[model samples]
Target chain A: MKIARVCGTVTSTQKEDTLTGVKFLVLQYLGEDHHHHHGEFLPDYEVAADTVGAGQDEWVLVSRGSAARHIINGTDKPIDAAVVAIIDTVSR
Target chain B: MKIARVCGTVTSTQKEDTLTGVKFLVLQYLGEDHHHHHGEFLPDYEVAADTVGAGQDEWVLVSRGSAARHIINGTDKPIDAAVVAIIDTVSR
Candidate 1:
């Protein structure tokens, strides 16, 4: 799982049926060195299907790959990423 | 699918019964703007289960997520990334 923060929402219409109620969010990953640093991440972002009720700027745990597809419905969904958990606090 | 180049091999003998006799490879993702760029990619890397007999320095097509598992014996292999096709030419 990667540490990421929700940056914005992704709205899609005329999409696949598997994502009927899925909320897609734009996320920016936090560097692994975030334990002591502030605001470090790559330029590109990730779009993840939100399983948790995550909101804007909320830090979260994200699962990528086929692993993401297993999170919901137990059936395969054409998704590459999913927000698995919302971070409560980041401890040192 | 993403454009990637095999960099090296990954040897493992300690775990995962489903991965028996499976060859693993280390891949570096090529930049999307590689249409004209000579060489450009992100740092770090990816480990993929080899479906095609891809060798080092060969451009390849990789499938990530549950999609990787669907390529093999059609069984769930507990894998995330897979080298589905080896590239012959990357035309501009």
Candidate 2:
């Protein structure tokens, strides 16, 4: 999992039926030191399926790869990344 | 899922037993505007488990996180990404 900030939402009408209700959020990766500073956006921002109701500007824990599917459980939606947890603090 | 192009294949003789039959492809991210032109490679190239038999130079949709694990089903492979679909067209 990585630390990211939810930037925005994407709406698609013409997608697979199985993806009907899932929410997609644009995420900007945050470096460890920049977690609370709202640093610059990572080179590549990602669109992640949201399992947790993370709002824009909220720090989130994004699970990538097959672990994303385990968050929602059941249903084979074509999602690569998912917001699994809303971060409260980063203690390192 | 995001748009990426397969650049090459990675062969690993020693991997987790569950990942024995999976083919790993090296992928570079493609921006929407440069989709067909084959733009510069993204900073981080990813190694994705391929189930779609995507060839080199092919544009594919990559599912990341735990969602990648769901692609193969019934096995725990330590894969961060998977080529879920081979994209044919991208229309605005």
Candidate 3:
């Protein structure tokens, strides 16, 4: 699991049939220096499936791989990373 | 599916119990410029499970998410990305 911020939605004209109703969110992963950037980010980006109905610029927790498949599952979902939760707070 | 170059192995003293004997390879993802740099790429990396018995510096095909779990399956594999095949040639 890792912390990320949702960037926004993506539109796909051609995609896998199983991904018809899925929402894809561009996510910027938060590194150790998570305080400097906000609302906008460049590369090192990841597009994830959003199961938790997160909004843009929201801090979220994400799961990758088959673990992500659990949030939205099927033998043919064609999913890798997913937003599992929208964060409520953070502390050291 | 994407292309990646095998860098080397990883050492883990503290890791998930399910990852005990899995061989982890640090993979350097090959972008548009796949030729200039060799054996010394930095960051933007990914570590993947090797199911194809690949060697160092080999350009290989990788699969992520549940598709990766297909190469090495289990209900508890704790895996996401995997080396599915070692590349023999490329033409584009």
Candidate 4:
């Protein structure tokens, strides 16, 4: 899992039916330095499927890979990243 | 799932046994503008487990985290990303 900041929403008129209710949010990767840069690095931003109802500008925990499917089961949904939790603080 | 372009393949002779039959592909993240750049930003590229048989230069959807584990269940794989679908179009 990695830390990311929810930046905005993505609108898709046509998509896989299984993604009907999934909220797709634009995410800016938060480096270990806790800084967000735009396009200076490749993959500066990404779209993530949200299950935790994370709002814009909120810090959230993003689980990547197969772990994302653990949130919505039974139906195969095509999603790579998911917001699993909202972060209130980062002690370290 | 986020859109990524398959760039190449990854070879690992030693890996988690469960990942034996999986194909790992190198992917370059595609921006919303549908452009592919190399290493201008961090995470310029990533390795994703492929189940859809995505080929080189093919744009595919990548599922991340636990969701990637859905392709092969009952076994713990260390992969964080997986190709779930080959993208046909990105209609606005």
DockQ (Cα-based) for each candidate: 0.07, 0.17, 0.09, 0.15
After superposition, candidate 2 runs with Cα above 4 Å error = A1-5, A11-21, A29-44, A51-92, B1-3, B8-17, B29-46, B53-59, B63-66, B78-80, B84-92
Q: Residue B57 CA error for candidate 1 (Å)? A: 15
Residue range B16-75, candidate 1, lDDT tens digits: 677654566566765445355656455655666664453436555455644345435346
Please, what are the lDDT tens digits per residue for candidate 2 over residues A1-92?
37666666444343233333556556666543544554556343366666545343656677765445544544554555676667566343
Chain A superposition TM-score per model: 0.59, 0.59, 0.63, 0.59
- What residue pairs are clashing in model 3? none
Each model's RMSD to truth, in Å? 9.2, 7.6, 9.4, 8.3
Residues A1-92, candidate 4: write the lDDT tens digits: 37666656554353343444566556676543534443333342376666655343646777765445555743553445677666666433
Q: Mind giving the per-residue lDDT tens digits that candidate 3 earns over B15-46? A: 23333345655666654354453445555336
Q: Which candidate's TM-score is highest?
A: 2
Which candidate, 1 or 4, has the higher TM-score?
Answer: 4
- Candidate 2: residue B75 Cα off by (Å): 2.3
How close to the true structure is residue B89 of candidate 2, measured as C-alpha lDDT? 47
Better of 3 and 4 by DockQ: 4
Please give the distance, in angstroms, between residue B30's alpha carbon in candidate 2 and its true position after superposition. 7.3
